[PDB]
């Protein structure tokens with residue numbers, strides 16, 4: 001039975017992952033907007049960050065941890081592949097997103113010359129990713145997954161972040177629109193996020 | 198199982214995977230990798246050019262914790278990640294906090310070389326010392342990291358505890374419960390079997 005409470009940053013891309021996941025699963029939950037921040041935030045998460053998930057005695061932070069937990073509590077729809085081989089591949093992709101893209105998102109969100117280096121790294125990495133979507137509907141092919149969940153807040157914020165993409169990036173934007181069109185995505189978007197595009 | 202593990206002979210990350218493999222008693226092949234003369238294909242299989250790498254048929258995994266979670270799911274005996282979703286989540290968060298709080302410093306110690314790295318090494322040592330010393334009181338009442346049952350958390354941290362002398366990390370006396378705990382790990386026959394000859398030399 002669901003008792004989920006999500007402490008969420010209204011313009012936080014990491015929080016948007018969790019918000020997206022909760023709306024995809026269509027279960028009961030409560031979102032608490034955090035203004036960057038009440039004292040209990042650093043009590044619940046010693047790193048002082050959102051998102052934070054609370055369900056009874058459980059306190060979780062880090063968006064991918066939170067989302068994996070939710071995906072296991074409410075397995076429909078399935079966001080992590082059921083097959084162990086596929087699940088491992090996907091976990092490795094998620095991890096690489098964190099290393100290759102979202103460390104730069106953190107720079108953009110949390111910290112000035114570093115911002116420029118961050119944008120360039122994100123452009124370059126997306127340039128490498130773009131050809132995937134020549135043939136694939138979603139990251140793992142036909143099925144929506146945690147990989148799409150994870151990257152969507154970044155793709156959403158490309159203009160907000162002042163990211164210029166290379167010529168080969170067109171299939172990536174088509175892919176991005178396919179995510180943004182999802183009913184859960186629309187529902188999980190904050191008023192503040194909606195203005196970004 | 199047709200698992201092949203590319204393993205660094207003194208690589209603490211590789212040791213996690215060797216340890217998991219011996220704990221589960223499955224069939225496997227270890228391919229010993231000499232990181233002083235790293236073969237080109239290591240960088241083909243893993244673009245970060247690091248070991249451990251697990252290859253099983255068409256699957257190529259790297260990152261020790263990803264490899265181990267995969268093995269644990271493929272062969273759940275004994276279960277190293279808790280079955281319960283709440284416990285599994287807690288455990289995953291603990292694992293992640295280990296990588297951030299401890300093993301970024303192990304990476305510094307292992308991967309950065311030269312006289313330039315020595316200031317970074319000293320910081321890595323101090324950070325590891327301070328963090329292990331904070332954790333130590335846990336092992337007064339707990340046999341293993343999650344209590345009575347051995348888990349992935351013990352797997353993850355053991356190669357570091359094994360290497361404290363090797364890294365020149367000295368803990369104060371109040372870290373004794375942590376050392377008792379470490380010996381509780383080291384005495385497991387799986388642990389002893391998974392040690393390479395070079396790793397055995399690491400603790401006088």
Ligand SMILES: N[C@@H](CCC(=O)N[C@@H](CS)C(=O)NCC(=O)O)C(=O)O
Pocket residue numbers: 205208209210211232235246247248249259260261262304307308
């Ligand atoms: N996060 C990785 C780190 C693995 C790693 O750093 N391996 C080191 C050996 S300790 C390596 O292969 N370095 C390659 C090199 O620089 O030659 C994991 O958990 O597997």
Ligand SMILES: O=C[C@H](O)[C@@H](O)[C@H](O)[C@H](O)CO
Pocket residue numbers: 026027028029030031032
């Ligand atoms: O904004 C937070 C609200 O709590 C909202 O998320 C609802 O509770 C949810 O839609 C339940 O379905």
Ligand SMILES: O=C[C@H](O)[C@@H](O)[C@H](O)[C@H](O)CO
Pocket residue numbers: 291332335342343344350
């Ligand atoms: O109560 C002890 C818990 O097991 C927890 O504290 C973990 O041991 C953690 O890894 C240390 O932060």
